[PDB]
Amino acid sequence: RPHLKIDLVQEGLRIQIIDSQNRPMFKTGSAEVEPYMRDILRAIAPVLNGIPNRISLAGHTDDFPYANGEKGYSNWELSADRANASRRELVAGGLDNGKVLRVVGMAATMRLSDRGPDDAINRRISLLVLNKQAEQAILHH
Amino acid sequence: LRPHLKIDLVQEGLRIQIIDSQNRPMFKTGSAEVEPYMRDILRAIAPVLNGIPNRISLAGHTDDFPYANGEKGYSNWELSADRANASRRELVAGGLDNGKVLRVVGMAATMRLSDRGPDDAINRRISLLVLNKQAEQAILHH
Numbered sequence: 093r094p095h096l097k098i099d100l101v102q103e104g105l106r107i108q109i110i111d112s113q114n115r116p117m118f119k120t121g122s123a124e125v126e127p128y129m130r131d132i133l134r135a136i137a138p139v140l141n142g143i144p145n146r147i148s149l150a151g152h153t154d155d156f157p158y159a160n161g162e163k164g165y166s167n168w169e170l171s172a173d174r175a176n177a178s179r180r181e182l183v184a185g186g187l188d189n190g191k192v193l194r195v196v197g198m199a200a201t202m203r204l205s206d207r208g209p210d211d212a213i214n215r216r217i218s219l220l221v222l223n224k225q226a227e228q229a230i231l232h233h
Numbered sequence: 234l235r236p237h238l239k240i241d242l243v244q245e246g247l248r249i250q251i252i253d254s255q256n257r258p259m260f261k262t263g264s265a266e267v268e269p270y271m272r273d274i275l276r277a278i279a280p281v282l283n284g285i286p287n288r289i290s291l292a293g294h295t296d297d298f299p300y301a302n303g304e305k306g307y308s309n310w311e312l313s314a315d316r317a318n319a320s321r322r323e324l325v326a327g328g329l330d331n332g333k334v335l336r337v338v339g340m341a342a343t344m345r346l347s348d349r350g351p352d353d354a355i356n357r358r359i360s361l362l363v364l365n366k367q368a369e370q371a372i373l374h375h
């Protein structure tokens with residue numbers, strides 16, 4: 093059973109989804125979120141509604157490339173699709189309108205460092221509960 | 234008159250906007266297909282971006298009009314993200330180097346243009362961002 097890891101960062105609250113068996117939370121090349129991940133995402137949505145802050149959603153991939161592999165569909169499209177896939181699950185969980193400020197596709201640029209040598213663990217999404225400083229930053233860009 | 238570049242300093246880098254005098258939207262309604270005149274511009278921008286060591290972020294935008302089922306299904310978030318990646322593929326086709334892109338962003342309709350309503354058609358667009366080293370480290374060394 094997967095769990096959320098929530099800790100403080102400069103930009104606010106970072107939320108990571110972590111599986112105990114170090115199992116990838118997405119099938120390779122897939123932006124379909126699994127039933128187990130579905131439940132934990134929908135469950136945290138009312139909590140996010142309580143927190144007056146807005147959120148940023150990020151999608152990630154392993155560094156297994158597509159055939160072209162940046163000319164057409166790539167890890168950029170896939171990571172972005174994973175971000176929005178998690179977004180739709182939060183909404184299904186009852187996430188309020190206007191809670192999302194940003195969806196982000198990171199491809200394989202944000203590599204985890206202490207979660208083992210298997211690159212497949214990077215197939216994931218992450219959440220960021222933005223503080224006022226991070227939000228005002230993003231908005232005035 | 235030909236469209237021009239609007240460049241200003243923002244917190245995580247150098248933002249690049251493409252401003253059209255003829256007020257042509259970069260995308261048709263509900264479409265993530267880059268309009269012809271913007272394709273030419275993005276391809277022209279790519280080799281210049283190759284000239285600097287900095288990595289790039291790409292953001293997509295939509296007008297205020299929502300989709301049929303609000304935000305439960307395909308929404309302006311998906312559309313804006315798809316528009317960001319469409320501009321990405323144009324840049325790559327223009328000769329953008331491998332590894333230049335660090336981030337793609339969907340902003341939906343949260344960032345209307347500086348003096349237009351959120352309903353205006355020219356909100357359907359993309360914007361470019363040249364990331365400073367600090368933003369790049371906050372992402373890579375995260």
Ligand SMILES: NC(=[NH2+])NCCC[C@H](N)C(=O)O
Nearest residue numbers: 113114115116119120210212
């Ligand atoms: N349960 C696990 N530890 N899985 C790791 C292996 C994942 C497999 N190599 C893949 O790409 O799909």
Ligand SMILES: NC(=[NH2+])NCCC[C@H](N)C(=O)O
Nearest residue numbers: 120121122153154155156215
């Ligand atoms: N089904 C595939 N085409 N897999 C290869 C690409 C996998 C991709 N890098 C991911 O994170 O899922």
Ligand SMILES: NC(=[NH2+])NCCC[C@H](N)C(=O)O
Nearest residue numbers: 262263295296298299300301
């Ligand atoms: N169901 C619809 N007709 N939706 C139209 C949404 C258009 C979208 N706001 C855009 O910027 O292109």
